[PDB]
Amino acid sequence: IDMEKSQQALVQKRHYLFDVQRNNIAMALEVTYRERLHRVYREVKNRLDYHISV
C-alpha cells in the first residue's frame, strides 16, 4: 500500500521534466535573440571604426 502511495506522490510531480524542457527552449531562443542583437551592434561599430581609423 505504501509503495503505491509513494508512486502516486511521484505522479503529481512527474511534470518537472517537461517544465525543464520548456525553460530550456525559451531561454535558448532568448539567447539566440540577444546574440543577434549584439552581433549587429558589434559589426556596425567595427564598420564605422573603419571610417574613423581611415
Binding site: 535558448a28 531562443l29 539566440t32 543577434r36 549587429v40 559589426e43 556596425v44 567595427n46 564598420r47 571604426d49 573603419y50 581609423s53 581611415v54
Partner: protein
C-alpha cells in the same frame, strides 16, 4: 611677438601650404605607395564586407 622673424616665417610657409593644398604637394610616388600599403593592411584587419552599406544577416533558428 611681431619680432620673431622665424615665427612669422613658419606661419607664412604654413599659409602657403594651406593655399597650395589642392593636391598633396611634393607627394612623390612614396605618398601613393604608402597610402595603398596601409589602406590594404587596414582592409585586411577589418574585413572584406560590402564596403558601401549594411550587409544582411539571414540568421538561422535553433
Amino acid at each position: 611677438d611681431p619680432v620673431q622673424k622665424l615665427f612669422v616665417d613658419k606661419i607664412r610657409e604654413y599659409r602657403t601650404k594651406r593655399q597650395t593644398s589642392g593636391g598633396p604637394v611634393d607627394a612623390g610616388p612614396e605618398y601613393q605607395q604608402d597610402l595603398d600599403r596601409e589602406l590594404f593592411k587596414l582592409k585586411q584587419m577589418y574585413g572584406k564586407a560590402d564596403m558601401n552599406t549594411f550587409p544582411n544577416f539571414t540568421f538561422e533558428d535553433p
